[PDB]
Write an enzyme that holds these catalytic residues in place. Structure first.
Site, PDB file in Angstrom:
ATOM      1  N   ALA A  28      -1.731  -9.421  15.568  1.00  0.00           N
ATOM      2  CA  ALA A  28      -2.519 -10.136  16.582  1.00  0.00           C
ATOM      3  C   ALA A  28      -3.653 -10.993  15.975  1.00  0.00           C
ATOM      4  O   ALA A  28      -3.964 -12.051  16.530  1.00  0.00           O
ATOM      5  CB  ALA A  28      -3.095  -9.152  17.592  1.00  0.00           C
ATOM      6  N   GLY A  30      -3.990 -11.135  12.133  1.00  0.00           N
ATOM      7  CA  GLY A  30      -3.745 -11.089  10.695  1.00  0.00           C
ATOM      8  C   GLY A  30      -2.322 -11.245  10.205  1.00  0.00           C
ATOM      9  O   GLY A  30      -1.400 -10.647  10.760  1.00  0.00           O
ATOM     10  N   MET A  31      -2.160 -12.014   9.109  1.00  0.00           N
ATOM     11  CA  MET A  31      -0.888 -12.301   8.439  1.00  0.00           C
ATOM     12  C   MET A  31      -0.816 -11.584   7.073  1.00  0.00           C
ATOM     13  O   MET A  31      -1.811 -11.524   6.353  1.00  0.00           O
ATOM     14  CB  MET A  31      -0.727 -13.826   8.256  1.00  0.00           C
ATOM     15  CG  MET A  31       0.622 -14.257   7.719  1.00  0.00           C
ATOM     16  SD  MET A  31       0.608 -15.951   7.090  1.00  0.00           S
ATOM     17  CE  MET A  31       0.967 -16.834   8.555  1.00  0.00           C
ATOM     18  N   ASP A 142      -2.572   6.046  14.070  1.00  0.00           N
ATOM     19  CA  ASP A 142      -1.528   5.045  14.287  1.00  0.00           C
ATOM     20  C   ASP A 142      -0.349   5.228  13.314  1.00  0.00           C
ATOM     21  O   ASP A 142       0.219   4.243  12.840  1.00  0.00           O
ATOM     22  CB  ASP A 142      -2.114   3.612  14.201  1.00  0.00           C
ATOM     23  CG  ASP A 142      -1.222   2.535  14.801  1.00  0.00           C
ATOM     24  OD1 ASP A 142      -1.241   1.400  14.287  1.00  0.00           O
ATOM     25  OD2 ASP A 142      -0.471   2.845  15.752  1.00  0.00           O
TER      26      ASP A 142
END
Ligand SMILES: Fc1cccc(-c2cnoc2-c2c[nH]c3ncc(-c4ccncc4)cc23)c1F
Length: 332
Positions: A28, A30-31, A142
């Site tokens: 969302a 960051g690459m 997560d």
């Protein structure tokens, strides 16, 4: 002078040390790219983070950097380097440099069938890594196959500590989150084990109600003790309004699975978080007997703690804290 590096129409200003970029994935804000490190003469993984428009994004970035720089464990990804602008006014992005692994468990399970020995070894490394995280009184929150990195020789590392807190993706969320403690990570590991056994997510809900319905479809209707906690009124009344659901035996869902794997899976996928198996007991379970080695399972020297109340700090103060934290990777 080649100028700044670019990937898919956006800046990826990591040169001159990091060149020959190749796109891996995207989030969302960051690459992730692979790059050639001209110092260590090896390809590395680099994540571009652009979090300064939101306070929550700044919190997550600072939390991850501080946790990963403190943590030192074979089954946890380390931070090798951090790139950002020379001045705070120019800092719009943060680039975190990490070891480039071969793949993740998400991609491996999408294309490969795992033997019981591979399932056993991966589960062992996840819990060994989790033993260290939990000993530092940190919750990952997560855990999922895309957050489990694998090298060519099948060695595993846990990554993405942005949502980590001191003591997420829907399909691996514990029912109490939907209805946080160390037990929420054990649930997520339970979901990952079930997925390694069948190459399919065990609870693939479209939304939180569908998630609870998927969980009850296998565990059966929850008992009085299961529901009686500090539970949301709507969620409680919804679960109570549902008709009876029978428990599906584990050996019926996974008929070709190792009976020891299913006994451990049962203890991790326990609806009540107080009755759920803890990380040390899971490592000591007979399923992991071939790999369990308490002589070679390091724990954190002391529990982790933030010096400040990160939730309460304005995004401008968090921007300054990120600038300060990343200063050690700057020349001079
Ligand atoms: F903070 C960082 C810094 C750099 C990368 C990440 C990140 C976020 N999600 O995966 C990674 C990876 C770190 N090292 C990696 N090595 C390989 C792969 C990878 C994933 C899928 N296919 C091929 C390679 C991902 C990562 C990250 F969280």
């Amino acid at each position: 002078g080649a100028g700044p590096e670019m990937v898919r129409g956006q800046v990826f200003d990591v040169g001159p040390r990091y060149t020959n970029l190749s796109y891996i994935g995207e989030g969302a804000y960051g690459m992730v790219c692979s790059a050639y490190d001209n110092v260590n003469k090896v390809r590395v993984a680099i994540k571009k983070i652009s979090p300064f428009e939101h306070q929550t994004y700044c919190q997550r970035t600072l939390r991850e950097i501080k946790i990963l720089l403190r943590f030192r464990h074979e089954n946890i990804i380390g931070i090798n380097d951090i790139i950002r602008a020379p001045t705070i006014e120019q800092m719009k992005d943060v680039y975190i440099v990490q070891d480039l692994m071969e793949t993740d468990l998400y991609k491996l399970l999408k294309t490969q069938h795992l033997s019981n020995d591979h399932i056993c070894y991966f589960l062992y490394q996840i819990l060994r890594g989790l033993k260290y995280i939990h000993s530092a009184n940190v919750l990952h929150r997560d855990l999922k196959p895309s957050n489990l990195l694998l090298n060519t020789t099948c060695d595993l590392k846990i990554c993405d500590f942005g949502l980590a807190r001191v003591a997420a993706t829907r399909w691996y969320r514990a029912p109490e989150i939907m209805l946080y403690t160390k037990s929420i990570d054990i649930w997520s590991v339970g979901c990952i084990l079930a997925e390694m056994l069948s190459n399919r997510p065990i609870f693939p809900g479209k939304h939180y109600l569908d998630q609870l319905n998927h969980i009850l479809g296998i565990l059966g209707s929850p008992s009085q003790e299961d529901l009686n906690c500090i539970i949301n009124l709507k969620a409680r009344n919804y679960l109570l309004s549902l008709p009876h659901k029978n428990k599906v035996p584990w050996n019926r869902l996974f008929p070709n699975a190792d009976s020891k794997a299913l006994d451990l899976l049962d203890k991790m996928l326990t609806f009540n978080p107080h009755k759920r198996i803890e990380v040390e007991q899971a490592l000591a379970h007979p399923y992991l007997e071939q790999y369990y080695d308490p002589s070679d399972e390091p724990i954190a020297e002391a529990p982790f703690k933030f010096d400040m109340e990160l939730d309460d700090l304005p995004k401008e103060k968090l921007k300054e804290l990120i600038f300060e934290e990343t200063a050690r990777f700057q020349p001079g």
